[PDB]
Amino acid sequence: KENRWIL
Amino acid sequence: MYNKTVSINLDSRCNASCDHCCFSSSPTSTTRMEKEYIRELVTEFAKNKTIQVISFTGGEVFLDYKFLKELMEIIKPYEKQITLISNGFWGLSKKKVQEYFHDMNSLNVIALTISYDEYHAPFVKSSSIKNILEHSRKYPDIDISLNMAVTKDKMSNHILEELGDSILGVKITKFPMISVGAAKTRIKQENIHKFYSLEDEDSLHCPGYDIVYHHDGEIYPCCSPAIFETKITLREEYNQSFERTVEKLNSNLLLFILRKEGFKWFLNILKENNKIEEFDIPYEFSSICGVCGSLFNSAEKINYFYPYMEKYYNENF
Ligand SMILES: Nc1ncnc2c1ncn2[C@@H]1O[C@H](CSCC[C@H](N)C(=O)O)[C@@H](O)[C@H]1O
Ligand code: SF4
Numbered sequence A: 001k002e003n004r005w006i007l
Numbered sequence B: 001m002y003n004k005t006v007s008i009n010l011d012s013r014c015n016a017s018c019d020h021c022c023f024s025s026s027p028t029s030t031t032r033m034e035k036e037y038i039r040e041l042v043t044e045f046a047k048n049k050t051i052q053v054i055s056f057t058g059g060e061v062f063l064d065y066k067f068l069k070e071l072m073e074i075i076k077p078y079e080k081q082i083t084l085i086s087n088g089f090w091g092l093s094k095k096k097v098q099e100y101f102h103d104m105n106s107l108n109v110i111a112l113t114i115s116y117d118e119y120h121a122p123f124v125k126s127s128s129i130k131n132i133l134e135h136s137r138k139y140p141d142i143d144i145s146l147n148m149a150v151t152k153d154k155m156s157n158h159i160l161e162e163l164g165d166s167i168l169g170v171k172i173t174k175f176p177m178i179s180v181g182a183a184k185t186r187i188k189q190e191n192i193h194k195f196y197s198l199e200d201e202d203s204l205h206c207p208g209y210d211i212v213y214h215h216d217g218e219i220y221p222c223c224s225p226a227i228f229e230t231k232i233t234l235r236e237e238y239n240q241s242f243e244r245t246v247e248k249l250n251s252n253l254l255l256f257i258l259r260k261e262g263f264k265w266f267l268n269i270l271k272e273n274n275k276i277e278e279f280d281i282p283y284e285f286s287s288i289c290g291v292c293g294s295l296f297n298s299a300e301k302i303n304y305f306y307p308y309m310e311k312y313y314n315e316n317f
């Protein structure tokens, strides 16, 4: 989810 | 808890200058941690017994490939898994694509995410993206994904069509914008999708924590574009160990209350005290992170919750 957006 | 993965944002410098960029990355971006400091961080993360995955982000991590391969080679003896995210500018040459995939396969890179959409299109040709996506077929152990950032006026409908059959078998996810960085000023807010509102609080929950050592020298509890404009930081000193970062994440009162009570705990305090307009909290949002960003993007905002969090601690523990 959004917690790993930029990865 | 939250100690099996870690991310490092290598630099804010990028070959592209996307109009939505949460970091406002560009070829002239100067915000970054020193190379020697990053080497020490990577060495510690590789020697750490609990970390399994180390992720690299930017900025554009393939811009200084020599440094990226050097960091991946520090990790190599320790056998940790690596993830990479890129704009795929290097895909222009099939020979470079061959070289990088061979390196990634031998350096335990388990996932590669390529970002391509109408915001990235002025800086990277479609053919570069196609080259990377086609060659990935030869490396089934590397998880390949295509991330497309869209707005109502720039839905990337023609971009997928022009990628042709290169996208066959690739996981594609189109996602809305977080109104942060260049998206705040270069995109009309009416073009950002609104999926959530202050009313449907029942679905307002943080997806989870993922530690990132960011290019501004700070440490963040997640990798969402929204967190980088908040004052929620896990760093207390220049030389801080991963054990201390994890202990700080696990003892942070605001993050504990956020995880356990959801955004409604903070939103109800502001509604009850008539501070929704004073804090400029938006009515609608593209994502749950948009609420997070606006609740905690200033020291005044965070400090406002302190007496309430203090009361919560006394009452519950
Ligand atoms: N304001 C924003 N809202 C949502 N996604 C954003 C954003 N700013 C950047 N992103 C997305 O976050 C991801 C990581 S940005 C840094 C990694 C790399 N240069 C890249 O482009 O992949 C990209 O997929 C990018 O489109
Ligand atoms: S979204 Fe990625 S490619 Fe675009 S400017 Fe930001 S860091 Fe660079």
Ligand code: SF4
Binding pocket: A002, A003, B205, B206, B207, B208, B221, B222, B223, B224, B226, B227, B288, B289, B292, B293
């Ligand atoms: S809700 Fe906040 S803490 Fe959770 S992932 Fe989104 S930005 Fe990060």
